[PDB]
């Protein structure tokens, strides 16, 4: 069964691109996933989504544009200091121009370019480009 919902959603958002869809539905509503989608929205990879509320694990309907190559998820979760984040973006992204490793810290969920601002590191959740 489902040990990671965020890890069955970024694959359910991976299999709609290689087909060429427009809008898709995900079954559980995590607060992590919600802070994740509102990370990808600030960079404008996707459109504006919405959440559906029953009194359960709510649902989400995402609108998709055409700039989203591959959204991923790391398992398991690690700890990444400031001298490891270089050796992750060395060999987990295409180039140094774009792509966004995303990681939670004690300050909140943010990308690595921001983690350099705030001089902070913490546990990793995934990557998207």
């Amino acid at each position: 069964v489902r040990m990671n919902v965020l890890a069955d959603a970024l694959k359910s958002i991976n299999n709609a691109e290689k087909r060429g869809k427009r809008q898709v539905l995900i079954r559980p509503c995590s607060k992590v996933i919600v802070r994740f989608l509102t990370v990808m929205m600030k960079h404008g990879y996707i459109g504006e989504f919405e959440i559906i509320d029953d009194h359960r694990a709510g649902k989400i309907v995402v609108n998709l544009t055409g700039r989203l190559n591959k959204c991923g998820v790391i398992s398991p979760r690690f700890d990444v200091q400031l001298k490891d984040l270089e050796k992750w973006q060395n060999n987990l992204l295409p180039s140094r121009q774009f792509g966004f490793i995303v990681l939670t810290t004690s300050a909140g969920i943010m990308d690595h370019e921001e983690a350099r601002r705030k001089h902070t590191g913490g546990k990793i959740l995934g990557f998207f480009f």
Binding site: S75, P76, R77, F78
Partner: protein
């Protein structure tokens, strides 16, 4: 890998620590009884004493009789088929001498056409064989 947890280290390391033993170059070189059953004992040269001169056929397309020397070693007491490399240099070897045997070069393995001969001859009676063959030196009479 197949398990990918955060605290699965004694499973990974006690799986690699077993499956290393099925390598061939790890098992022959590292612990095991190959260094025990090496006739040299983990070294690159060995002296010996000749006891007989014999020849060995060659294998397929080829048809000749290569030349070999049965040698008994000093430090163990085992018996080795050596090889006389050059042309006609069997006629400089007389019985009950000392030869300095070197390994051939495929790490203890049969080579070329010659069936099962590991080791070759470098020096004879403390006279280097390239000089005894060429002419720079001469057998001590």
């Amino acid at each position: 890998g197949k398990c990918r947890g955060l605290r699965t280290a004694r499973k990974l390391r006690s799986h690699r620590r077993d499956q290393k033993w099925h390598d061939k170059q790890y098992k022959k070189a590292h612990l095991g009884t190959a260094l025990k059953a090496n006739p040299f004992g983990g070294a690159s040269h060995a002296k010996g004493i000749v006891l007989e001169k014999v020849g060995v056929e060659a294998k397929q397309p080829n048809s000749a009789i290569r030349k070999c020397v049965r040698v008994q070693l000093i430090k163990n007491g085992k018996k080795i088929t050596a090889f006389v490399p050059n042309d006609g240099c069997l006629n400089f070897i007389e019985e009950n001498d000392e030869v300095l045997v070197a390994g051939f070069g495929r790490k203890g393995h049969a080579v070329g056409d010659i069936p099962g001969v590991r080791f070759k001859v470098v020096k004879v009676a403390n006279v280097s064989l390239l000089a005894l063959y060429k002419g720079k030196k001469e057998r001590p009479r």
